[PDB]
PDB file of C-alpha atoms (C1' of nucleotides) in Angstrom:
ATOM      1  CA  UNK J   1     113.882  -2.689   8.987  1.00  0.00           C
ATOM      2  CA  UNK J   2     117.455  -2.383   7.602  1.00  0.00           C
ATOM      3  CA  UNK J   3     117.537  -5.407   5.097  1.00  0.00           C
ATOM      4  CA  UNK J   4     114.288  -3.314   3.476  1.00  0.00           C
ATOM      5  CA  UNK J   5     116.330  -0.113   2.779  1.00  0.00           C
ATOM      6  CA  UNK J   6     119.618  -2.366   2.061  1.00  0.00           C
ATOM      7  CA  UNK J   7     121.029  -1.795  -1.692  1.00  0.00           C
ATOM      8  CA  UNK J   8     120.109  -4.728  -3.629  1.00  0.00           C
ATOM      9  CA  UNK J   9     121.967  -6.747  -6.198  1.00  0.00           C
ATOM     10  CA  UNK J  10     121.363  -5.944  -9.787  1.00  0.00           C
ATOM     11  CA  UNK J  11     120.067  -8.725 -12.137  1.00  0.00           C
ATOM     12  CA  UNK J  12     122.235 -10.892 -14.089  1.00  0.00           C
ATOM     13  CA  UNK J  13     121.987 -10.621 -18.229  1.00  0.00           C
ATOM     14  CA  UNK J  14     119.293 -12.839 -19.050  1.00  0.00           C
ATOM     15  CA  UNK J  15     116.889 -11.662 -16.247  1.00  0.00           C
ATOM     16  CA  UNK J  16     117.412  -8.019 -17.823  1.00  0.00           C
ATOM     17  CA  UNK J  17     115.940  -9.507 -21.144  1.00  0.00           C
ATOM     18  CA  UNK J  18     113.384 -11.896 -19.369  1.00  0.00           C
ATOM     19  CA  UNK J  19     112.141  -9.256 -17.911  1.00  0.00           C
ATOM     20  CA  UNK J  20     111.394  -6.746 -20.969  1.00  0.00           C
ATOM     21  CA  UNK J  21     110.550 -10.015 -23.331  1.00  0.00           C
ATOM     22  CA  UNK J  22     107.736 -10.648 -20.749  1.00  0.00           C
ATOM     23  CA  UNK J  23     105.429  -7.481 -21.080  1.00  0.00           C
ATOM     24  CA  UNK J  24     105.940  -7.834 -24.777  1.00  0.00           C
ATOM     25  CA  UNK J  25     104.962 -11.800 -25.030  1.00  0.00           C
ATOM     26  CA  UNK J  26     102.086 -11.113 -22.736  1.00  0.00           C
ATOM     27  CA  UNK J  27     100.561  -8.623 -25.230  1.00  0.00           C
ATOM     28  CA  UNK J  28     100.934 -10.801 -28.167  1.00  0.00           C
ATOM     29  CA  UNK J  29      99.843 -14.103 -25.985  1.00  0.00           C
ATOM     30  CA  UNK J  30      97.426 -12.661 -23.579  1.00  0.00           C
ATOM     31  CA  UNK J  31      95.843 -15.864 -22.349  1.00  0.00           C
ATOM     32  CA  UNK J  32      98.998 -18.183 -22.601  1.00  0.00           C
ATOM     33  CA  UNK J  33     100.704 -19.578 -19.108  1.00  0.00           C
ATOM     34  CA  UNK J  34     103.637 -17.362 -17.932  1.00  0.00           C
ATOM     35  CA  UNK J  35     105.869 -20.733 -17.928  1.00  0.00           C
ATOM     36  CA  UNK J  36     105.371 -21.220 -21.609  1.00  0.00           C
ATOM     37  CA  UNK J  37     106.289 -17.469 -22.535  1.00  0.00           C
ATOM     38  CA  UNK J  38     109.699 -17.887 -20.369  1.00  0.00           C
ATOM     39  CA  UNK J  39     110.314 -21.258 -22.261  1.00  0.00           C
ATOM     40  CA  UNK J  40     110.004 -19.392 -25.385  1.00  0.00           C
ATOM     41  CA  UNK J  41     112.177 -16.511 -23.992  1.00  0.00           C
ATOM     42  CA  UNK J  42     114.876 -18.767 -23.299  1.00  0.00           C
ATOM     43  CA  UNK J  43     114.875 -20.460 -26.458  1.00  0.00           C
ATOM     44  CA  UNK J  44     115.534 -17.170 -27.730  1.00  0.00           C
ATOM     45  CA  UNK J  45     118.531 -15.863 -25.310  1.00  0.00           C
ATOM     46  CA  UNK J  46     119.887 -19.098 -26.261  1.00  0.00           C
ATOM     47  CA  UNK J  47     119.760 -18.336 -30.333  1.00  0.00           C
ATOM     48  CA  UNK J  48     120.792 -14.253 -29.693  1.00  0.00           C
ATOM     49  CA  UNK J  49     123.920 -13.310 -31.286  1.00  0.00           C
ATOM     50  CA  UNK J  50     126.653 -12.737 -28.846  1.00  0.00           C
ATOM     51  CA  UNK J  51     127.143  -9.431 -29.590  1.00  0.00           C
ATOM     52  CA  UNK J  52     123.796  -8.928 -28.583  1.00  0.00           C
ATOM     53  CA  UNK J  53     124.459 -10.641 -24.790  1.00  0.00           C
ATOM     54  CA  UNK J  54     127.664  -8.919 -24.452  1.00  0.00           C
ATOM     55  CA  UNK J  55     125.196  -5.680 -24.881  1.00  0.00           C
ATOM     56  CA  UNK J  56     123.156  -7.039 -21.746  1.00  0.00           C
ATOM     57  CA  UNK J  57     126.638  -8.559 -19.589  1.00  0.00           C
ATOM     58  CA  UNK J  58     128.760  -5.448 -20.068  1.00  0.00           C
ATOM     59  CA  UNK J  59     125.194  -3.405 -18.614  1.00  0.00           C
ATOM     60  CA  UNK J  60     125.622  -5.844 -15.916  1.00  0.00           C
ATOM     61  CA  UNK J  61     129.434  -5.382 -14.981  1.00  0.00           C
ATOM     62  CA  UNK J  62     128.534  -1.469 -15.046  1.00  0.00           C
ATOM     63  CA  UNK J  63     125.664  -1.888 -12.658  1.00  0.00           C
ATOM     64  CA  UNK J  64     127.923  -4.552 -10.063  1.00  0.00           C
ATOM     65  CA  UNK J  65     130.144  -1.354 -10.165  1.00  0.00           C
ATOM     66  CA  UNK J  66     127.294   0.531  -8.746  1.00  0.00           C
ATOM     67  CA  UNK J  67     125.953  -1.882  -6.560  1.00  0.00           C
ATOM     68  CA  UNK J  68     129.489  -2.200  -4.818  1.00  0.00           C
ATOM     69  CA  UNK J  69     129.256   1.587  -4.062  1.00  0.00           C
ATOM     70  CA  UNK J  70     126.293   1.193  -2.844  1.00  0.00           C
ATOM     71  CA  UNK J  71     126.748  -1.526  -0.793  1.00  0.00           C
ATOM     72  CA  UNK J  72     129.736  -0.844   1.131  1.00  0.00           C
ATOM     73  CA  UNK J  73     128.556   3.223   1.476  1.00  0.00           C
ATOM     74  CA  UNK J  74     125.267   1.147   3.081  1.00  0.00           C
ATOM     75  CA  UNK J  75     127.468  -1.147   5.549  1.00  0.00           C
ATOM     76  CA  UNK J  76     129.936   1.784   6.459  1.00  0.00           C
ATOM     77  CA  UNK J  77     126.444   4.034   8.075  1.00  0.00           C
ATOM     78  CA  UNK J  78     125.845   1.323  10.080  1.00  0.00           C
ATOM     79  CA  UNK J  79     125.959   0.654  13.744  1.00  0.00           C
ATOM     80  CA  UNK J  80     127.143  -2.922  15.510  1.00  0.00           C
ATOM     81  CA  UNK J  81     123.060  -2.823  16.442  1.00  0.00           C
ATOM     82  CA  UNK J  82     121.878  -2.491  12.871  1.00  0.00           C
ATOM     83  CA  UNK J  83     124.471  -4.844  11.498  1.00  0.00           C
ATOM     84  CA  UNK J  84     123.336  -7.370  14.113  1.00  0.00           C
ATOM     85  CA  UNK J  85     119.530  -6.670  13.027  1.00  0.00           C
ATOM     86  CA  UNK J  86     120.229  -6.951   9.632  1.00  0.00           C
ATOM     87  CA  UNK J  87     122.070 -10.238  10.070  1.00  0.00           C
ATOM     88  CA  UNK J  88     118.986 -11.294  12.258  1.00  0.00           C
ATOM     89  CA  UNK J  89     116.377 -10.331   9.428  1.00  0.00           C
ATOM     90  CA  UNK J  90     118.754 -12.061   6.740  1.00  0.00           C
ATOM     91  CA  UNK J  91     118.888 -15.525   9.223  1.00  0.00           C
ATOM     92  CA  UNK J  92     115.335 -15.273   9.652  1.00  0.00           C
ATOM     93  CA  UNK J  93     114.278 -14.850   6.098  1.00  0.00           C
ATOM     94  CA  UNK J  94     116.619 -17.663   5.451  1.00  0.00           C
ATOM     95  CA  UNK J  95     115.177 -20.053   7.669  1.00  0.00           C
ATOM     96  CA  UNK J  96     111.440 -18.835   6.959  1.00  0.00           C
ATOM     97  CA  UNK J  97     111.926 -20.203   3.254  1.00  0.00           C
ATOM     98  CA  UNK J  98     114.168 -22.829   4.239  1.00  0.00           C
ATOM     99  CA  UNK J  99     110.749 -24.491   6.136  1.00  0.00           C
ATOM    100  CA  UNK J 100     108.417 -23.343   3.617  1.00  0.00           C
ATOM    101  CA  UNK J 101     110.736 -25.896   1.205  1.00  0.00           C
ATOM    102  CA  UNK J 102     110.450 -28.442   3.679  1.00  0.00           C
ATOM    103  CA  UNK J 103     106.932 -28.187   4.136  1.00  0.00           C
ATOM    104  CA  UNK J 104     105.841 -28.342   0.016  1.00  0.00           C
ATOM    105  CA  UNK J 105     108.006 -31.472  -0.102  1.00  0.00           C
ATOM    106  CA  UNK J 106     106.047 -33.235   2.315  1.00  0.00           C
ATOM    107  CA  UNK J 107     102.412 -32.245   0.815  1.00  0.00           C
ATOM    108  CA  UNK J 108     104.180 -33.215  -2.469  1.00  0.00           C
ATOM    109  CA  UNK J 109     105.622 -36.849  -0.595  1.00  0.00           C
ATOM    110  CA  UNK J 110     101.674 -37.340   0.244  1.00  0.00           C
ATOM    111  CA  UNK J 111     102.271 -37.032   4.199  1.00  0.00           C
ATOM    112  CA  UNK J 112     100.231 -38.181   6.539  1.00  0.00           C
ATOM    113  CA  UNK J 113      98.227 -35.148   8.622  1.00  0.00           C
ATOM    114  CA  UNK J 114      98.718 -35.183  12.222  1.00  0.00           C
ATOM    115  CA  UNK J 115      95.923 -36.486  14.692  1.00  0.00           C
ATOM    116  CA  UNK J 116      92.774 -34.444  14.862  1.00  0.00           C
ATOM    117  CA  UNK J 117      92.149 -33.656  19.029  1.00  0.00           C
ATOM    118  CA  UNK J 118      88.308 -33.565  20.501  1.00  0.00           C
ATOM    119  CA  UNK J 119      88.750 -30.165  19.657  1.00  0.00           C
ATOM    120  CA  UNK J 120      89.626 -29.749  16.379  1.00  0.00           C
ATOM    121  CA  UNK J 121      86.795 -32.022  16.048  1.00  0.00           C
ATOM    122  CA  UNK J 122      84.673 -29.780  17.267  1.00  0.00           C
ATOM    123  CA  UNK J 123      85.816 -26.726  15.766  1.00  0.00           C
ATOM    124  CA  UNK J 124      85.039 -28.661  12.350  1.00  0.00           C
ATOM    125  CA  UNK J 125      80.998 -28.898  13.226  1.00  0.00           C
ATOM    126  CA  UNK J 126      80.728 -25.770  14.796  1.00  0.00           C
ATOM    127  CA  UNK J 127      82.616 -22.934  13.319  1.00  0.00           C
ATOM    128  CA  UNK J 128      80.146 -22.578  10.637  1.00  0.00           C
ATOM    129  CA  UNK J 129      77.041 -21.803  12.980  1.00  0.00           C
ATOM    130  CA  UNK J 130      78.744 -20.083  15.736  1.00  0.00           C
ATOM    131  CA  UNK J 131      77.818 -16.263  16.157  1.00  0.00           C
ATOM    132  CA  UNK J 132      80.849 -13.681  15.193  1.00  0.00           C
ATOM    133  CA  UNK J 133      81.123 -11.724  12.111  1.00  0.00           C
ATOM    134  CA  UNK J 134      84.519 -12.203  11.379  1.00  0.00           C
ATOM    135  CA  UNK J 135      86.566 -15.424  11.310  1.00  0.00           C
ATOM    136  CA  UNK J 136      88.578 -14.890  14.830  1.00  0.00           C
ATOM    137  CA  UNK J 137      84.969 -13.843  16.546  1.00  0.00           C
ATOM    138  CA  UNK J 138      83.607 -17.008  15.800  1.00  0.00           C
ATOM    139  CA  UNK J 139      86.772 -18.564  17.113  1.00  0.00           C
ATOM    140  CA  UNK J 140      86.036 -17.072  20.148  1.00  0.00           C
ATOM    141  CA  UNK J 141      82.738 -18.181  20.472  1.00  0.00           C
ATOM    142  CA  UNK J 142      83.762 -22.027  19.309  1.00  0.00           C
ATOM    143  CA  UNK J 143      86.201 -22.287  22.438  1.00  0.00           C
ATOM    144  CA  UNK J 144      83.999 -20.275  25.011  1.00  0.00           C
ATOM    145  CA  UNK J 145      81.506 -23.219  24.111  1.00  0.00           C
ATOM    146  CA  UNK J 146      83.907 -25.804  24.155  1.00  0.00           C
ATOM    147  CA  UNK J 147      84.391 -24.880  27.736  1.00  0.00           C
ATOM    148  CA  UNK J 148      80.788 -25.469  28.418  1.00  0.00           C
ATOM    149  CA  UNK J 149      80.810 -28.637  27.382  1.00  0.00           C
ATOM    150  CA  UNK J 150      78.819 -31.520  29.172  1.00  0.00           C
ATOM    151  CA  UNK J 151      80.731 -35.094  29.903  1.00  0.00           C
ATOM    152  CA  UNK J 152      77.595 -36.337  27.466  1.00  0.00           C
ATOM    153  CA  UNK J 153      78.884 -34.173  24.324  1.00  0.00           C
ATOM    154  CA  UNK J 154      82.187 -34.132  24.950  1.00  0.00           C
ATOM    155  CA  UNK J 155      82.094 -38.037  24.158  1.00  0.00           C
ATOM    156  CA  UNK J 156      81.320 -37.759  20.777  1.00  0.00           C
ATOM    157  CA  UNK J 157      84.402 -35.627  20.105  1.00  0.00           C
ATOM    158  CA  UNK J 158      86.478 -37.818  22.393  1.00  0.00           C
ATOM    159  CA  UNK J 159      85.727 -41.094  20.043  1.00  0.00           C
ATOM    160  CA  UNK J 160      86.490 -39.169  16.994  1.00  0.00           C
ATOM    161  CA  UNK J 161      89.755 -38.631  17.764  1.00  0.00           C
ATOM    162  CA  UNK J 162      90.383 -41.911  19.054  1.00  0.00           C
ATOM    163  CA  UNK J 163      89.307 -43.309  15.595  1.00  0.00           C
ATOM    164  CA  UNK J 164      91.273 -40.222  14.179  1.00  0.00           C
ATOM    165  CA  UNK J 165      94.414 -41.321  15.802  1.00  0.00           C
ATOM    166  CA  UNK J 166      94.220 -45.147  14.758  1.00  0.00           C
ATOM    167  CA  UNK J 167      93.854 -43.707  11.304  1.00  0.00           C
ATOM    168  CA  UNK J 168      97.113 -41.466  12.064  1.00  0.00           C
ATOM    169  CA  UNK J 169      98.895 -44.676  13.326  1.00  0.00           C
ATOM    170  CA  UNK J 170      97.796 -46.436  10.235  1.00  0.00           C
ATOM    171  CA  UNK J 171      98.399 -44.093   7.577  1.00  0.00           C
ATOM    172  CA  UNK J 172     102.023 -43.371   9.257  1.00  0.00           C
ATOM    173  CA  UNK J 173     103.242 -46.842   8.988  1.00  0.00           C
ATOM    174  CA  UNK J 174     102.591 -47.201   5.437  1.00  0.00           C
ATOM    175  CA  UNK J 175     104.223 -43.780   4.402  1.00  0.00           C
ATOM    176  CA  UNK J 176     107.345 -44.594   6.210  1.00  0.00           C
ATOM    177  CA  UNK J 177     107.993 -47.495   4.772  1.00  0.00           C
ATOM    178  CA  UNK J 178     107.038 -45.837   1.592  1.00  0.00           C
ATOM    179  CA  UNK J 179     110.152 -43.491   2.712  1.00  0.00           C
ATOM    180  CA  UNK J 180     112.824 -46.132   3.022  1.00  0.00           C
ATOM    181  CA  UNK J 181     111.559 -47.738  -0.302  1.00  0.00           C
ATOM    182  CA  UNK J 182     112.376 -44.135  -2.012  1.00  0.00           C
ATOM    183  CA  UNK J 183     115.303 -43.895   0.073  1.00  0.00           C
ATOM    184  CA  UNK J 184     114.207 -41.212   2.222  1.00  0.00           C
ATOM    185  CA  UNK J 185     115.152 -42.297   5.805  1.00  0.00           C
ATOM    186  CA  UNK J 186     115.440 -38.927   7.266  1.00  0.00           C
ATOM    187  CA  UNK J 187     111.740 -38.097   6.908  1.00  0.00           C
ATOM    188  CA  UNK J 188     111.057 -40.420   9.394  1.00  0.00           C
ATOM    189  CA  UNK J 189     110.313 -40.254  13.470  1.00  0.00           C
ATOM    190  CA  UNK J 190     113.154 -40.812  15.371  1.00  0.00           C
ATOM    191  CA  UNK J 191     109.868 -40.747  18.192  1.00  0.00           C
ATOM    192  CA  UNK J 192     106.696 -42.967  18.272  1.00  0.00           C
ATOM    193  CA  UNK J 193     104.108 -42.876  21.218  1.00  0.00           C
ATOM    194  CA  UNK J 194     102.718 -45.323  22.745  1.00  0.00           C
TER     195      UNK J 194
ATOM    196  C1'  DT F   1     121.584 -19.239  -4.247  1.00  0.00           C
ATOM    197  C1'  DA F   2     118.461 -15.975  -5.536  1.00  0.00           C
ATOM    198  C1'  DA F   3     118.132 -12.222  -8.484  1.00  0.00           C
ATOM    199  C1'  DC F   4     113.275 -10.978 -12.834  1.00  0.00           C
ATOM    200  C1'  DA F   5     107.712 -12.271 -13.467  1.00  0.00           C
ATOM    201  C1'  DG F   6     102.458 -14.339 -13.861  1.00  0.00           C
ATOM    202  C1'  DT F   7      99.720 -18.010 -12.273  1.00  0.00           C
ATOM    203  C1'  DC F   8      98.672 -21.835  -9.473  1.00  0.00           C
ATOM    204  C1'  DA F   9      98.000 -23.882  -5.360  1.00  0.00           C
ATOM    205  C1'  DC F  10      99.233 -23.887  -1.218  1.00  0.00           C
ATOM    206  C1'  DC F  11     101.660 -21.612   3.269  1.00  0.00           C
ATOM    207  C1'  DC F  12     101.870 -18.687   7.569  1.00  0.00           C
ATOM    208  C1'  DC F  13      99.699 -15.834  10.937  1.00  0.00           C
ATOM    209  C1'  DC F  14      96.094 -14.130  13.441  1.00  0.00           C
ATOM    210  C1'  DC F  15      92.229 -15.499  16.910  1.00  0.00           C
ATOM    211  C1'  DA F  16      92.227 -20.658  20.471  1.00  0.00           C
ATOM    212  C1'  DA F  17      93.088 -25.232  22.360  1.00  0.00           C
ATOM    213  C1'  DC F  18      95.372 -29.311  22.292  1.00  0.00           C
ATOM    214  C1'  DA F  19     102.901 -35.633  19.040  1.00  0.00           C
ATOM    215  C1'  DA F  20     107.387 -35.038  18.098  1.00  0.00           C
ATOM    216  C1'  DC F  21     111.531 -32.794  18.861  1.00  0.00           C
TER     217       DC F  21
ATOM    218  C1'  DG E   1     109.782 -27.286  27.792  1.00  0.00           C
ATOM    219  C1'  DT E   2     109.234 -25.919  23.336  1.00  0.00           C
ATOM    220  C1'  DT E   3     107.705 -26.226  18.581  1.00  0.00           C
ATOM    221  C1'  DA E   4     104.856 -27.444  15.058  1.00  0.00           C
ATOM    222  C1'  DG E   5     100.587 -28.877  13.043  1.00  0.00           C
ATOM    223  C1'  DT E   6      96.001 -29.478  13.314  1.00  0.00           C
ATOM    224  C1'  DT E   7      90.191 -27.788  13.057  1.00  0.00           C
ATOM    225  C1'  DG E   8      87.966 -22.641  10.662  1.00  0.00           C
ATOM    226  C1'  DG E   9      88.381 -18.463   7.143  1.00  0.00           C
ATOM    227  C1'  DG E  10      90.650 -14.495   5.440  1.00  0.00           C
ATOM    228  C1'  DG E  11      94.548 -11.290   4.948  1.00  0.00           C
ATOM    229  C1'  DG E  12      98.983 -11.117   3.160  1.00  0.00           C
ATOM    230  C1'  DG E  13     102.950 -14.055   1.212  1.00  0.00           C
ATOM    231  C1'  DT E  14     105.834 -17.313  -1.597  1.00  0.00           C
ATOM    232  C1'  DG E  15     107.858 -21.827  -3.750  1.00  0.00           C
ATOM    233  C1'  DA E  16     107.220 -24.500  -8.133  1.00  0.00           C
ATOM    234  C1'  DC E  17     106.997 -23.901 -12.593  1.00  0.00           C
ATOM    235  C1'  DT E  18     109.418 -21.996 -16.978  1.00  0.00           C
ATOM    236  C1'  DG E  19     114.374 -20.206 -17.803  1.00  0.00           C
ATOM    237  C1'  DT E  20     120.219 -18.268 -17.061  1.00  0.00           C
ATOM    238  C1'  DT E  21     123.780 -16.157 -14.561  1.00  0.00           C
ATOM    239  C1'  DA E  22     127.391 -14.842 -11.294  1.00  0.00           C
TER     240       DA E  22
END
DNA sequence: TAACAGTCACCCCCCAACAAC
DNA sequence: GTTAGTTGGGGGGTGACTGTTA
């Protein structure tokens, strides 16, 4: 809401030349990976004559000029409300990425996935036949018959996940004492059930 | 820290139900 | 009690990789 019209900062010097030296090493290197070209563009901010950054940095002290203006003319409009939601929208973004992190470290540590319920069980066999066109219809349809469920079929999914969760219990054990032998204590439970 | 960007390989959120903090 | 992560796919999104700077 406000943090989308908010004055943003500029770029720094060698962002300002990353960013034109990109288009330009794209069309000579069409089917090269973008991490390569920005090696190579490095390599050559790194050999440019100073001269030639102090071209880039004193275009970047002009536009922190501007962004000040801009920035404090911004904050001044405001209300305490909008401040507050901006703050809000600033915390939330924040914390958003700030779990995101979190989460790619763990895939990348080779977690352990939770415990798979009766349920998810079931969803797994019978998404793919049940009727709906779209993805959240056939949800519907999976729980609706989930409900319906006999004591007979429901047994199936029950044992399952009581294999699933000895394989949870399993699987846990020896990634957490993989964690201490990297020296990463505070990835573990400070929790177990029973 | 997070600004620029293309690609990869997930991640989050919706619809729903069902251990760890 | 509340949050987060799970089974399913698909829309819409982003951190890691490649870098430096303020």
């Amino acid at each position: 809401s406000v943090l989308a019209s908010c004055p943003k900062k500029p770029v720094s010097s060698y962002l300002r030349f990353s960013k034109e030296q990109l288009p330009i090493f794209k069309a000579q290197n069409p089917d090269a990976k973008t991490t390569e070209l920005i090696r190579r563009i490095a390599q050559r901010w790194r050999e440019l004559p100073d001269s030639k950054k102090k071209i880039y940095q004193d275009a970047y002290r002009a536009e922190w000029q501007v962004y000040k203006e801009e920035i404090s003319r911004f904050k001044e409009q405001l209300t305490p409300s909008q401040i507050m939601s901006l703050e809000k929208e600033i915390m939330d973004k924040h914390l958003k990425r700030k779990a995101m992190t979190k989460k790619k470290e763990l895939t990348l540590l080779g977690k352990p996935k939770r415990p798979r319920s009766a349920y998810n069980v079931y969803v797994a066999e019978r998404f793919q036949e049940a009727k709906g066109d779209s993805p959240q219809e056939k949800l519907k349809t999976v729980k609706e018959n989930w409900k319906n469920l006999s004591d007979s079929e429901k047994e199936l999914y029950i044992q399952h996940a009581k294999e699933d969760e000895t394989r949870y219990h399993n699987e846990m054990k020896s990634w957490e004492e993989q964690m201490i032998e990297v020296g990463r204590k505070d990835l573990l439970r400070r929790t177990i059930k029973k």
